[PDB]
Enzyme design. Sequence first.
Site, short mmCIF file in Angstrom:
data_model
loop_
_atom_site.label_atom_id
_atom_site.label_comp_id
_atom_site.label_asym_id
_atom_site.label_seq_id
_atom_site.Cartn_x
_atom_site.Cartn_y
_atom_site.Cartn_z
N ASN D 130 0.85 -1.19 0.00
CA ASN D 130 0.00 0.00 0.00
C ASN D 130 0.88 1.24 0.00
O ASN D 130 1.72 1.41 0.89
CB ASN D 130 -0.93 0.01 1.21
CG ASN D 130 -2.02 1.06 1.10
OD1 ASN D 130 -2.79 1.07 0.13
ND2 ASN D 130 -2.11 1.95 2.09
N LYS D 154 2.63 -4.20 3.39
CA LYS D 154 3.59 -3.13 3.63
C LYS D 154 2.85 -1.81 3.41
O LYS D 154 2.36 -1.55 2.31
CB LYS D 154 4.81 -3.24 2.70
CG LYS D 154 5.77 -2.00 2.79
CD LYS D 154 6.67 -1.86 1.54
CE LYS D 154 7.51 -0.57 1.49
NZ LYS D 154 8.45 -0.54 0.28
N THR D 156 3.15 2.04 3.23
CA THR D 156 4.09 3.15 3.04
C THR D 156 3.26 4.42 3.20
O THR D 156 2.58 4.86 2.26
CB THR D 156 4.79 3.09 1.70
OG1 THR D 156 5.62 1.93 1.65
CG2 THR D 156 5.65 4.33 1.49
#
EC number: 4.1.2.55
Lengths: 293, 293, 293, 293
Positions: D130, D154, D156
């Site tokens: 993401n 994940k 971000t």
Amino acid sequence: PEIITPIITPFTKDNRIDKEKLKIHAENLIRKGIDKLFVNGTTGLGPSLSPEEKLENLKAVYDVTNKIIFQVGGLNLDDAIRLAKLSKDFDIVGIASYAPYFYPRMSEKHLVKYFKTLCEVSPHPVYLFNYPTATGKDIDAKVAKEIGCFTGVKDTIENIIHTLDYKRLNPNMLVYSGSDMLIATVASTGLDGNVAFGSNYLPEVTVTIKKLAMERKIDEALKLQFLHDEVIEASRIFGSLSSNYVLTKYFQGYDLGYPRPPIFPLDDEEERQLIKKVEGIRAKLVELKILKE
Amino acid sequence: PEIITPIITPFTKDNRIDKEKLKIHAENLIRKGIDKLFVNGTTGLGPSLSPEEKLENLKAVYDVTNKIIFQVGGLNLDDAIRLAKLSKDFDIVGIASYAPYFYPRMSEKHLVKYFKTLCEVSPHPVYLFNYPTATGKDIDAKVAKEIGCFTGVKDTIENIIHTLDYKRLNPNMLVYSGSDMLIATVASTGLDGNVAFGSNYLPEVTVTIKKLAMERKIDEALKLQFLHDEVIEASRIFGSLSSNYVLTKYFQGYDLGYPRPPIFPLDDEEERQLIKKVEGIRAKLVELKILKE
Amino acid sequence: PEIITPIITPFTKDNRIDKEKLKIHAENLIRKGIDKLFVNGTTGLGPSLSPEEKLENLKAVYDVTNKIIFQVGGLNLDDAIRLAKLSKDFDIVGIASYAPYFYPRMSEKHLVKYFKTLCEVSPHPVYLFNYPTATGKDIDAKVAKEIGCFTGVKDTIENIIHTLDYKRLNPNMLVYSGSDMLIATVASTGLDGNVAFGSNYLPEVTVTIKKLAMERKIDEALKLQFLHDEVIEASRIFGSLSSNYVLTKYFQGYDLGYPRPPIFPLDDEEERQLIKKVEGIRAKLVELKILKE
Amino acid sequence: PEIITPIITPFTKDNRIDKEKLKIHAENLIRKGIDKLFVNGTTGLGPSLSPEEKLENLKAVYDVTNKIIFQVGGLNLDDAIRLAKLSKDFDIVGIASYAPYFYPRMSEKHLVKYFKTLCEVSPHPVYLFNYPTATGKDIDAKVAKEIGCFTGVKDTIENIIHTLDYKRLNPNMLVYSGSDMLIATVASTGLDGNVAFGSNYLPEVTVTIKKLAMERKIDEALKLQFLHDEVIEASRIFGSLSSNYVLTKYFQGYDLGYPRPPIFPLDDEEERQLIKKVEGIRAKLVELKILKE
């Protein structure tokens, strides 16, 4: 780390501050382990109070506790200065101000000047209240350093990197988060605590999350944290600033009167439906023995 | 279409409204062709004014002209209601309110109730002031339709699609822009004009742009619009709300006193650098015969 | 001013470009008064096409018309360069590129270098495609000036001040808007036209809005503009890039096959419901005789 | 918790993947304690890679380690499907995809179908990447739950509330952060670690921060986190994705070739100024015995 309550301002039916209900609320908060009370903050509808009403709120709370951070800011610097000086006769933790709100594109020089003026006149330590969504401006760690006179900062923002940068650039500054959803994380990562609006209605939950995190029980802290997160979501359904009144009556058993319109009180159906959303969470908090019924 | 001036509030050295300088300014603006005056707007530091000071501003401008839209909003609805009612004894164009500011995540229902309450009590047409950056909320064309009692809207937003949508969903509403850089565009696309903060200091420019656009001399209206754009850009260097005081003195020849801190006045050097930034523009304007001298 | 169609790329059931359906679409567009075709743009799923497919699309459209702006950009500068050079053998209006997408925090020096490289190799005039929402970067009027080699710019942004600034800083640059909702406004305010995705399915409407505005019939232009606005809203229900296929079949009577997943085709129920939303608008366009049934 | 390196893709002068430099880099990272390698991520310029090049990257890193998460996404779903299927013959940790990028206003239904399609075909666990700033879409914890087939995410994003919400709504999901400035915080608040782009050039730092945090030496983890923060800030001056090449050569002693334009390499002077910005940090790290020499 600490849990600081930005305390609700109860109003009468005639749109006056209900001082006796406020004293009962503050008393319960301190008894339940809240370290300090942030007066005239957002949750207290500070921006909706006159200077005289902001002072009114200080005096009422001070009759219960001296552990007060006194928010004095506004768009009339003369009034903010006068409130700052008036606090000299009180044994309080500090004064605070949010950045000048409404007006966008304010120069950094003028923002710095506003805070430095408050520091020049303060008889107490000064706390930066950083709330970019509400005020339109960010007083970040670099600017706070430039200003140079803050004992602490409350950072209300959706970005914990931003909050950590205050410690990185000002290692001797107290650094708090305004995100109730980050109590466990803030405690676990070396910051100094939370100014938690939800501690108005679930002070037991907020102090226990922090305590579990400091006991190195992060999983248990996150479990309780996620339940607090669900109550916060429910308060947003109808508007959290109005819903905070209903939720405090529900969970703490005394009423806080009315908000100040345009922060309109929930009607009886909204209250019914809000309680529906948190009824099960109360039951689980009772089972866990965080709430004594 | 119309040019409407959100008129500056001149303050004294000791932070009172300078009623005499305000009348002088209002007289010049009407004399130079300004259609109406918007009082206690952003440019007039309306949010910095107490209810009594908002009414003091109305009385002073009312000595000059009836062509007044009276902004009355704030975070105490009783106070805004009181100002709306007091306006009955003034023969003016209407009253106005920006949305409740500061507080984020206000429900649409509470925002609607705020505006409807003012409408219920108003003895005049009511104008919506939409300024999402300043207030944190957008009252778009759909919500304005839902509220259903506005005679006009001033939309302070760079997205002119948003502004046009008020006409598309509310065909009988007067629709103004608050973006000075769009006076030529607004006048040429069928909208009702601009509330132009830069008409405080260059009313001649703002009126002439509207005129050229009405004559479908769009290329000549853009050349003057683009010079006006350069003065706005210069005003932002040291802060627009403070710089407008300096620019009105430079271009119109009379003093408007001081702003109200934290809108701090420019210092003598800042004044010099700003004048240097725009004195070429003044020459270009004298040459074009828009400004005398 | 001009209406430029960012032309849809029809795909086969096997995810190949359906060249014959594209030629039929381009032919109809030109016959209905579209000035030029922007190939491999957003609406054409340019970013989803290989270099070889982008060339494929050029050759197909060129068999119908040479009035082509050929979009060549991508994250492999070597491929973009090769496509730029290949266009030397075509009599087209120009090549174009959007800014490098996906990666944020790209330096201005690298962005300028990317475009200057394309200019150095182009055998045709070069158009800036500015689309900050899609690419993450803004190549504003100052940067476009710094780059110095753009014959024109398409500005897809919710801010017509931004678009006008290209004319202000680059007075000899062609300046187009990518907002279908601003056709009337763009024409009325001295800009050079629109790259209108809705001209794929209602080319009659888009050219008539512009023509009415240039005939000084702004009210009539806005009436037609507001009807086009309603069709655009309907296409957003299920995703405008997918819905563009359904709407072109509905209004123009030939089908454009399929989009390229993850731009998924609407199913048969979504198509049914979309047509429900625009059925009445078609009827009103027939009555006004903009559509010949 | 874990440190995962989004591994850099070294390119040759003529813009091919330098498989030999890539193996050297992967060997060092594993040798220095990195847990897994994320291949064809942002830091590896994954969106700049063709499908064949994404698979070429997998094969090269696979010669070194099985601890690979293989990013396969793109705007051609047939191509991503093909890469997902080809990964069956590699004994790796999982595959991964960022959301479809560039196109705004993609329906939630189409985004969900994209991820579900990859899940249906995947021979390995699937990880959501993401990255809302890069892709223009957010696949938050609720949508991830709706999709229902992810083994990890994940996230971000600077808002760690968002990241924590994945754990709260999907308790069995692995949850990683993509924000290098949060390694100490993430490790201490009960999350599963960081995909840390700065572990490319300072794997020793990133691993040691995680260790200190796991030991509840939060103050010592923050001191090292804050030094790591300073290197990231320096990398941004000339552009992070380009600067990571220079920083890996400086700190780890071997060449990683070139980036792929428009990710242009730093020039010799830019390199010198960057080294000057961080050479003090290197000394501080040598002194602290985190780096040799």
